[model samples]
Target: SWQTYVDDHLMCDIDGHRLTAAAIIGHDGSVWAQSSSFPQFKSDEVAAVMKDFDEPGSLAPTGLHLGGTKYMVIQGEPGAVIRGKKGSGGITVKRTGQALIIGIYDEPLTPGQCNMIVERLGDYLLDQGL
Candidate 1:
């Protein structure tokens, strides 16, 4: 299962560069991906992507330590920045009942690419009847 795999095999295309995290494809054609937790900001700076937890299940830092948050399962290029709060910014991909979230730590994403990628993923899921 992908949950048991490491985060170095997921595949993605970012900024024209292909990326992969630990990947494991299920017999049923399900895909699971993981992302490494990297330091996304310097002291006093908000994470490149701020995950507000005000809404139920919203992503947020859990401990007093500011690090160690699971920002996203990024397999593609870290895109350019989009508008965000404080120092946090990101783009979201929403499927029928699932969403793939992405963000940038040092740059912004092209709006066109972000939307297209999300749409492609959504289409794939739909094809699989997910």
Candidate 2:
């Protein structure tokens, strides 16, 4: 079911925004579901992201690291969202109660737009208590 949700819903384009790859990972940093093309969102790296939420400034200096790609965190809300960019491509992560909903986008997909969709789904899952 988790895999279905990621595969069917989160791995697509919405409006002009694009989600190139995506995943739903537990707060403990375990991979729950990921798009087929979703590459290494390694557990330790994911845990580092979760850790940043508790310690606000941690990610700012070093940046949001994922899939061996270092993304510069442009802006984020503590305990809620993180948006990062590497050239034209970027990463957006939204934290819900139990998991983080991640979206990866490129080119025309601005960071804010990417956050909106990921955060929207994050809200949806939060409401369901998932």
Candidate 3:
């Protein structure tokens, strides 16, 4: 069921483009759903990311790690969303009611575009009280 969401909703093309990688993960780092193309995310790495939602200020100084790539955080809305930049690529993570929606985008795909896609799903999930 969760995999369906990742494939149909996330991995699907949006305006003729797709996310480099995407996933819906539990706050505790449980994999709810993820794209086949998604990279391997270490358990501790994921835990560190999840911890930021609680201690929001720490991410700024430490940066963020997604798929082993360290990204400089551009904006982090406490317990809400985090947007980070790495060269022309970036990663956006939105925390909904019970999970986090992650989207990774590269050059030609603006941060706003990725945020919109991820946030849309996040809202939908939130509305469902997930």
lDDT of 3 at 50: 73
Rate residue 13 of model 2 by lDDT.
Answer: 67
Candidate 2 residue lDDT tens string, 26-128 = 9987888887777786777777788888887687688777877889887778878888889988998889898988888887877667776778788889898
Which candidate do you rate higher for lDDT, 2 or 3? 3
User: Model 3 Cα displacement at 53 (Å)?
Assistant: 1.2
Which prediction has the highest TM-score against the true structure?
3
Q: Candidates' TM-scores? A: 0.35, 0.89, 0.90
Clashes of each: 14, 0, 0
lDDT values for all models: 0.32, 0.80, 0.82
Ranking by TM-score: 3, 2, 1
Ten residues in sequence with the least summed lDDT for candidate 3 = 5-14
Q: Which stretches of candidate 3 lie over 4 Å from their true place?
A: none
Q: Residue 92 in candidate 1 has what lDDT?
A: 37
- At residue 105, candidate 2 shows an lDDT of 81
Q: TM-score of the candidate numbered 2?
A: 0.89
Model 3 C-alpha lDDT per residue in residues 1-130, reported as the tens digit of each score: 7887777777667677777888998877788889877877778777777778788867768888768898988886787888888999899888987888898889778788888888878989899988
Query: What is the Å distance of residue 16 in model 2 from its true position?
Result: 5.0
Residue 84 of model 2, lDDT score: 81
